[PDB]
Amino acid sequence: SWEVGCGAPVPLVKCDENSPYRTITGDCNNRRSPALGAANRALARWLPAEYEDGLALPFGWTQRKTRNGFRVPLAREVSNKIVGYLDEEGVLDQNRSLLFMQWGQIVDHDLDFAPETELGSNEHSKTQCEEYCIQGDNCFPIMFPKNDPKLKTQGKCMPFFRAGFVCPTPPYQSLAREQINAVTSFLDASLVYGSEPSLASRLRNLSSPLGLMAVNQEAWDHGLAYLPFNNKKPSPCEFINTTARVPCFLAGDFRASEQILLATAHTLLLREHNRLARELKKLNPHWNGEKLYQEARKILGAFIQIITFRDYLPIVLGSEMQKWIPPYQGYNNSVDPRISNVFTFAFRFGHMEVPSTVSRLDENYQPWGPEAELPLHTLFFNTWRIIKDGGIDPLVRGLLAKKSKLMNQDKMVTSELRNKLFQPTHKIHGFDLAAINLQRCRDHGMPGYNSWRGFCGLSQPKTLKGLQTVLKNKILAKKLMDLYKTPDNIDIWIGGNAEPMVERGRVGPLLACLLGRQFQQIRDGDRFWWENPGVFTEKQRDSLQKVSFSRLICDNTHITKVPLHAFQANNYPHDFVDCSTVDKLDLSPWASREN
Ligand code: HEM
Ligand SMILES: *[C@@H]1O[C@H](CO)[C@@H](O[C@@H]2O[C@H](CO)[C@@H](O)[C@H](O)[C@H]2NC(C)=O)[C@H](O)[C@H]1NC(C)=O
Ligand SMILES: *[C@@H]1O[C@H](CO)[C@@H](O)[C@H](O)[C@H]1NC(C)=O
Numbered sequence: 166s167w168e169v170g171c172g173a174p175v176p177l178v179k180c181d182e183n184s185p186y187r188t189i190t191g192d193c194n195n196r197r198s199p200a201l202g203a204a205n206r207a208l209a210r211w212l213p214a215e216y217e218d219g220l221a222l223p224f225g226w227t228q229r230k231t232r233n234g235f236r237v238p239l240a241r242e243v244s245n246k247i248v249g250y251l252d253e254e255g256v257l258d259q260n261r262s263l264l265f266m267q268w269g270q271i272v273d274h275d276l277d278f279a280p281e282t283e284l285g286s287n288e289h290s291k292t293q294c295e296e297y298c299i300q301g302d303n304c305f306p307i308m309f310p311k312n313d314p315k316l317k318t319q320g321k322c323m324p325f326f327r328a329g330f331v332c333p334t335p336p337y338q339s340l341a342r343e344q345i346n347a348v349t350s351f352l353d354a355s356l357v358y359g360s361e362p363s364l365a366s367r368l369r370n371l372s373s374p375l376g377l378m379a380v381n382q383e384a385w386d387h388g389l390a391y392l393p394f395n396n397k398k399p400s401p402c403e404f405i406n407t408t409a410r411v412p413c414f415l416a417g418d419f420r421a422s423e424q425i426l427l428a429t430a431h432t433l434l435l436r437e438h439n440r441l442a443r444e445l446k447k448l449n450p451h452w453n454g455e456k457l458y459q460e461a462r463k464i465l466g467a468f469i470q471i472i473t474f475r476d477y478l479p480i481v482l483g484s485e486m487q488k489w490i491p492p493y494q495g496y497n498n499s500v501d502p503r504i505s506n507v508f509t510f511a512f513r514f515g516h517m518e519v520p521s522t523v524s525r526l527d528e529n530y531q532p533w534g535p536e537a538e539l540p541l542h543t544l545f546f547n548t549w550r551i552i553k554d555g556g557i558d559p560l561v562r563g564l565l566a567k568k569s570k571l572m573n574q575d576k577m578v579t580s581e582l583r584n585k586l587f588q589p590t591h592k593i594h595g596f597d598l599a600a601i602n603l604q605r606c607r608d609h610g611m612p613g614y615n616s617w618r619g620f621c622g623l624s625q626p627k628t629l630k631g632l633q634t635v636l637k638n639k640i641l642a643k644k645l646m647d648l649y650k651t652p653d654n655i656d657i658w659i660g661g662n663a664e665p666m667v668e669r670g671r672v673g674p675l676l677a678c679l680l681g682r683q684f685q686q687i688r689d690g691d692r693f694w695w696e697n698p699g700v701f702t703e704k705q706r707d708s709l710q711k712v713s714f715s716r717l718i719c720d721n722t723h724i725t726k727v728p729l730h731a732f733q734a735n736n737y738p739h740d741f742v743d744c745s746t747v748d749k750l751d752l753s754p755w756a757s758r759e760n
C-alpha cells in the first residue's frame with residue numbers, strides 16, 4: 166500500500182472521553198477515529214480527484230491537454246455566455262425571504278473553508294499574478310476571452326490562487342492533491358467560536374467570569390453589542406472607505422465581513438451567546454466562566470442545528486428531503502462526518518440566490534432614509550454602513566421583508582457578484598464569483614457533471630438532445646455543448662445548478678442528492694448532535710424544540726414585529742406578529758441543583 170494517513174500537520178490528539186462539550190477543533194468527536202471531522206485536515210473524497218496529470222494540475226492548466234478529447238472552456242467565457250444576465254426585473258423568489266439566502270451562507274461557513282495557499286507572504290506573485298497574469302505554481306489566473314469587456318478595462322486576467330492542500334503546500338505529497346477544510350465539519354457554531362484554540366480564546370471575554378464573548382468597546386448599536394474589530398492591516402473593510410476607516414469584524418470565521426448581511430447574522434449569533442450566558446448565570450450563580458461559555462456555546466450549536474434541519478433543509482431539498490435525510494435514529498459512529506470536496510461546490514447553489522440590492526427598512530418596514538436600497542457590490546467588506554448608518558436592525562428588517570433571488574436558467578448570477586465582486590488585496594470591484602467557482606472546481610480536481618450524475622444514480626446525457634431533456638431547456642443545453650463539447654466535461658458547479666429545481670425545493674436532483682447525503686452524514690456522524698440521547702436532557706430538548714429565527718431576532722434587536730415563518734416571503738404588516746406571541750427558549754431545565 167501507500168500513505169494510509171498523511172497527518173503530519175496537527176498531530177495533537179489529546180482527548181477527554183468524559184467531556185460533555187465539543188472541542189473547538191472538532192477532534193475527539195468520533196472515539197475510534199478522533200480526527201474525523203476535525204478542522205485543518207483534508208476534505209473527504211467521495212470520488213477520486215481528476216487532474217490533468219493525475220496528481221495535482223487542473224484541467225485547463227496545459228493548453229494542449231484535453232479533457233476527454235476536448236479543450237475545457239475558459240471559466241470567464243462560461244460565466245459570460247451562460248451565467249450572466251442584464252434584467253433584474255422578475256428575478257426574485259416569490260416564496261423565500263432574503264434570510265433564506267443568508268442562512269445558507271451561515272451554514273456553509275460553519276461547515277467548510279478551503280483557504281488560498283500561503284505563498285504570498287512578502288512575495289511578488291501576490292501582485293505579479295495580478296500584474297503579469299503568468300500562470301505557475303499557485304498562480305492560476307482566470308484569463309479573459311477575446312470579446313470580454315473586462316479585457317478593455319481590467320487587463321488580461323483576474324488573479325486566482327490555488328487552494329491550500331494537506332502535507333504542507335509548496336512541495337509534493339502522497340499521490341493526489343487533497344485540499345484542506347480549515348473549519349470543523351460538525352454543524353457546531355464554529356463560525357461564532359472559531360475552529361482553532363488561539364482564535365477561540367481571542368474571541369472570549371476572559372476578564373469577567375461570566376462566559377461572555379468579547380464585544381466592540383468603540384461602538385454600540387443603541388446599547389446593543391457589535392463584534393470586536395479585527396485590528397490587523399491591511400483591512401479590506403477600511404480599504405473600501407478610507408474616510409470612514411471602519412475595520413472588519415473579528416468573528417469565529419475569517420469571512421464574517423465579506424458582505425454586510427453576513428456580518429449582520431454573525432452579530433445576532435454573538436448577541437445570542439452573551440444573552441444565553443447571562444440567563445444561565447442567573448439560574449446558576451455557582452457556574453464559573455468556562456461552564457457558562459460551554460453551556461451557552463452548546464445551546465447556540467443546537468439552535469443552529471435545529472433551524473438548519475427543521476426549517477432550512479426541507480425548503481432547499483423539497484421532495485428529496487425524506488429520501489436523503491430520514492427522521493433521526495441516533496448517533497452512528499460508522500458514518501463519515503467529514504465535509505466532501507464536492508459538497509463545497511454543491512452548496513455554492515446559494516450564489517444564484519443573491520439579489521442585486523440590499524435594503525435598510527424603518528420600524529414601519531418602509532425605506533430607511535433616502536438611500537435605503539443599495540447595490541450589493543457597495544456592501545462587500547462594508548462594516549461602516551452598520552457602525553455609521555443605523556446599526557443592524559434596518560438590515561435585519563430587510564432580511565425578513567425582502568426576497569431571495571430565484572435561480573433562473575436564463576438569469577443565474579447577478580452582475581453584482583459576476584462583474585463587481587471585491588476580493589481583499591485586490592483593489593477593484595471587478596471580480597467574477599461564477600468564474601472563480603468554475604476555476605476552483607478545476608483547482609480541486611472535481612470529477613465532471615456525468616461522474617456525479619452516476620454517483621447519484623441519475624442518467625448521464627451524452628448528446629445535445631440528452632442534455633436538453635435533463636435540463637428541460639434546449640437553448641441552455643446548446644450553450645453548454647458549444648462550450649464544453651461533451652456533458653462529461655461540464656464543471657459540477659454549473660452542471661448541478663443548470664438542472665431544474667425539485668418540487669417544493671430550490672435545487673435540482675443532482676444537487677439534492679449531493680447536499681442530502683452530506684447533511685445526512687453531518688447529523689448521523691456527530692456524537693454531539695443535539696437530539697442524540699444524553700447530549701441534552703429530555704426536558705432541555707423539549708425547550709430547544711421551540712427555538713425560531715423569529716425569537717432570535719426578538720431577543721437580540723429592538724425589532725418587535727416578526728413573522729412566524731421567517732424563511733418564507735413575508736409582507737408587513739399582514740405576515741408579521743408582536744414578539745409577545747412568539748415562543749421563547751425556556752432555560753429553566755438548565756437550572757442545576759446539587760443541594
Ligand atoms: C453576497 C453573498 C455571497 C458572497 C459575497 C459570497 C462570496 C464567496 C466567495 C468569494 C467565495 C470563495 C470563492 C473561491 O475562492 O473559490 C465563496 C465560496 C463559497 N460560497 Fe459564497 N458568497 C455569498 C453567498 C453564499 C451563499 C448564499 C451560499 C450558500 C447558500 C454560499 C456558499 C459558498 C460556499 C459553500 C463556498 C465554498 C466555501 C469553502 O469551502 O471554501 N455563498 N463565496
Ligand atoms: C464613506 O463613509 C463616509 C462616512 O460615513 C460617508 O459619508 C457620509 O456621506 C454622506 C454624503 O454622501 C452624508 O450625507 C452622510 O451623512 C455622511 N456621514 C458622515 C458621518 O460623514 C461616505 O459617503 C462614504 N463614501 C463611500 C465612497 O463609501
Ligand atoms: C468583559 O465583560 C466585562 C464584564 O461585564 C465588561 O465590562 C467588559 O467590557 C468586557 N470586555 C469585552 C472586551 O467584552
Ligand SMILES: *[C@@H]1O[C@H](CO)[C@@H](O)[C@H](O)[C@H]1NC(C)=O
Pocket residue numbers: 497498499500
Ligand atoms: C451506520 O452507518 C453505516 C455506514 O454508513 C451503515 O452501513 C449502517 O446502515 C448505519 N447504521 C444504521 C443503524 O443505520
Ligand SMILES: [Ca+2]
Pocket residue numbers: 275276348349350351352353354355356
Ligand atoms: Ca463547524
Ligand SMILES: [Zn+2]
Pocket residue numbers: 386387723
Ligand atoms: Zn434601538
